[PDB]
Amino acid sequence: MVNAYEVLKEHHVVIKGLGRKISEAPVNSEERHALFDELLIELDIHFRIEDDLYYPALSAATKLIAVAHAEHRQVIDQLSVLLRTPQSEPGYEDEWNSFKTVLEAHADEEERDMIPAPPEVKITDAELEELGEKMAARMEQYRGSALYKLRTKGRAALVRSL
Numbered sequence: 001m002v003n004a005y006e007v008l009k010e011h012h013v014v015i016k017g018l019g020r021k022i023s024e025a026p027v028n029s030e031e032r033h034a035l036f037d038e039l040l041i042e043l044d045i046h047f048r049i050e051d052d053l054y055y056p057a058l059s060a061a062t063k064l065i066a067v068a069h070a071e072h073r074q075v076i077d078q079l080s081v082l083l084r085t086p087q088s089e090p091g092y093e094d095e096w097n098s099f100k101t102v103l104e105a106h107a108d109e110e111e112r113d114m115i116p117a118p119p120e121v122k123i124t125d126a127e128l129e130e131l132g133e134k135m136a137a138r139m140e141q142y143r144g145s146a147l148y149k150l151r152t153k154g155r156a157a158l159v160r161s162l
């Protein structure tokens, strides 16, 4: 029995783990570049299942929804800055740390304010299980579509889709 909270919390552990592996890999190594692509795929599908399934179910918390959408914009705007400093450039590691900082702050502020749903949200254990099952399925669909974009259209087209 899965539920919406566990889907997001476990996926957060995935994303955080990729962030740690990226940080530990040598700058501009083949290993770090592949790990970063993997993070882009997982970020893409994470924000999508939040925007398309999780936040709508939490829509009653209108102020916290606005904040969460604004924090997604924070992360995406910082990713655009990160992508303008290749790993071969001297200031790359500062840009990566700035990105990692913004991303993990959001995910922590999410587990503060949005998991479990705020008190305004009336959602039952049964609904949370069905929503969790929908999210798990949609994350799989989204990962297939993300991979297809990266594989056939390249990293730039994946980033533009966020």
Ligand SMILES: [Fe+3]
Binding pocket: 047, 050, 068, 072, 106, 107, 110
């Ligand atoms: Fe989020």
Ligand SMILES: [Fe+3]
Binding pocket: 008, 012, 046, 050, 107, 110
């Ligand atoms: Fe999240």
